[PDB]
Amino acid sequence: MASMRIPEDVRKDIPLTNEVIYFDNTATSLTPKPVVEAMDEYYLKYRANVHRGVHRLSQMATHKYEESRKIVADFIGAKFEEIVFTKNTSESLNLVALGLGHIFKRGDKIVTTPYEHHSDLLPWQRLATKLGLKLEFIEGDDEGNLDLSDAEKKIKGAKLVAVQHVSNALGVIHEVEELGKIAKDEGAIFVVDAAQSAGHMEVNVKKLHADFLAFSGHKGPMGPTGIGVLYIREEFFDTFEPPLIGGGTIEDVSLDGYKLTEPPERFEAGTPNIGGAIGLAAGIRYIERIGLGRIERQEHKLVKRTTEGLDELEVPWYGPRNLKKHAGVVSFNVPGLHPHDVAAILDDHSIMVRSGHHCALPVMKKLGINGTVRASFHVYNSLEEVETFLGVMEELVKGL
Amino acid sequence: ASMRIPEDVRKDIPLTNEVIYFDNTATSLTPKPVVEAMDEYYLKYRANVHRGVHRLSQMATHKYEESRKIVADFIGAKFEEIVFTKNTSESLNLVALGLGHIFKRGDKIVTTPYEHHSDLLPWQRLATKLGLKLEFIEGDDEGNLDLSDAEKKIKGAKLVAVQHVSNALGVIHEVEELGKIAKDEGAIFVVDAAQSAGHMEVNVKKLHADFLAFSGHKGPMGPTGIGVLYIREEFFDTFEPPLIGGGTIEDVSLDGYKLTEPPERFEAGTPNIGGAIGLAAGIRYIERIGLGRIERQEHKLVKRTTEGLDELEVPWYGPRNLKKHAGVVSFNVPGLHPHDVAAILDDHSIMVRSGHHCALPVMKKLGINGTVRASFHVYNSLEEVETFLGVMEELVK
């Protein structure tokens, strides 16, 4: 944290900030020039494959790649070797299902939240349907709040528990420390989908009691696309069956068979996205120079004014009224308009917002609604942007 | 077509001024214009994807669709047969898992003996696991396949998996012929095109390909983290997606899921939008040059390299027939371990790989310590080969 000005100093580094009001941060973040500069120095000044090749470019590439992995480890409070690069969260999550499927005896149980993004349920659905498991969901309200007692009940007996850290559609910050304690207490394996928290707030494997953790570099960490992370705790290195296998993943091969290498290269099949990982590390550097603390507060501040303003205007919004449990995402609807129409109207005013089911149709169904419109923030978003949003919403609403 | 001097091309690659990069089968050097294409996504139209209403997502989606269409045309495939992955090895692994459900114990798979671990281990595991017959087509130590032994091994296998080119030796296997055999015998044909893809013509129809994998960071002069899996139209109701979730569905509930149409059915999560656009920029850059001109320039490099090594009497490997030798030449200095040779070349600003090369039954085949590999692309020049021979001369004394 090098004391400098929020949001302006971050805005200085993101040209799109002068062009549009970008409230679509849960879809993906905007990307600061230093993140793109860090990638461009890889591609133009030390371009090479890794795997400890002798020549000097590959030394650099390899150094830079392992630096990236250490930075990603430290960001999340893990050990170097516990970190696996993937293309995205979704890959990471599918890898947990495909990795561990051999452990599951028929009639074993898995438990998750009802609010999951599609990539943290239907891998668990496929696996259940395939193996004859019981897939159980813990109760909670329309506001997003989990029934913790029902959790303590439903988690009793489970071989595995999978939960989102924050919901991409409601903005619920679930109480995953409590949820983790409870899974640890009850023996179960705890897998945490941290896609919408990573980069926006503290995600630490120790505090969260996590055995598996997934996030995407293109969201809150301000990294490029094509770079996810999968955390695998040391404990599971001799249970977890590498789903992807090939180049970079062995110490000897023959036409007969194979013998695998150590983590983390055990789980990384082929040429990794070295460019992406270096981009990702620059994002995390960018983030920890700002401070998770300062990012939290900005976001919280934009949510408070957004929610007050929408209250003033007779516009209903979803997720926790208790803003301590509300991430930098506010979903909402204008009665009389479809969400896609609200979002086209905002787009006409250069305000970017998502509309539809947000890859979380179950949520939409639990609320009895045909989609929502979604404004989501990051630290580079400003109160002026919010105000000009509430302005057009106001013109919108009293045009009905 | 069209319209330029090789080797320049060099003009777009600053590193070409600092070093002689002869490590192209590992990864390619990347032209400024490809990086420029990615930079405008990240700085001028950054967004997902999934036809979202705002103009950035419109632009990004349009450009991502464009990207897929360009890849499709590059290999003569249809839009919806192209799935994006992180690399070749994901693509091949995805083929293993994507139709493991069609095999039964005692069904046979056939490969080449050479042969990248990424086009081997997912077949070795899938055989051990389901109790399958795994059989290797015969070839000599130059790497030329016996096409007679091909004809008797393809009859009657469920699938055939071959390199288009070896990354150790540089053989171009005669895959239009292997595809014909597989087709005639009714095997599913999978082609690992990780070494052919931006150096020579690769065309799914000509190849009789049912599945095809390649990597953007190699020959297509694209970024890292982007790979392609071609799935022919005929396997859409057979092939099950091993990765599923966001972007993969028509409807979902707590009860279950219904999947979407291809290609998006096989693409889970936010794709690497950046890499896709970059890869498209790469193939655009390659098409502007011409694959025939790339083939010819690599061929000159290989001709002068090998005929110069003959001159120095250093042993080299792969087909003596240059028609059947890609832009890679593995060699060794008798009494020098390959890493020392590579260390010495590096000291002269010459980048080159050494070791087993994620190949290995080749390093046994063909029993030897390992090999030093110089590999090429269109931006490499004769004068660079010439100076490489010069330090080889000095080293041989």
Numbering used by the authors:
A (entry chain B): -2 to 397
B (entry chain A): -1 to 395
Pull text from the paper.
Sulfur, essential to many biomolecules such as sulfur-containing amino acids and cofactors including iron-sulfur cluster, is usually mobilized from cysteine by the pyridoxal 5′-phosphate- (PLP-) dependent enzyme of cysteine desulfurase (CDS). We determined the crystal structures of CDS from Thermococcus onnurineus NA1 (ToCDS), which include native internal aldimine (NAT), gem-diamine (GD) with alanine, internal aldimine structure with existing alanine (IAA), and internal aldimine with persulfide-bound Cys356 (PSF) structures. ToCDS belongs to class II CDS based on the primary and tertiary structures and showed the highest similarity with EcSufS.
The crystal structure of native ToCDS (NAT) was determined to be 2.6 Å. There was a dimer with a twofold symmetry in the asymmetric unit. A protomer of ToCDS comprised three domains. The PLP pyridine ring was well stacked with His114 and bound to Ala192 with van der Waals interaction at the opposite side.
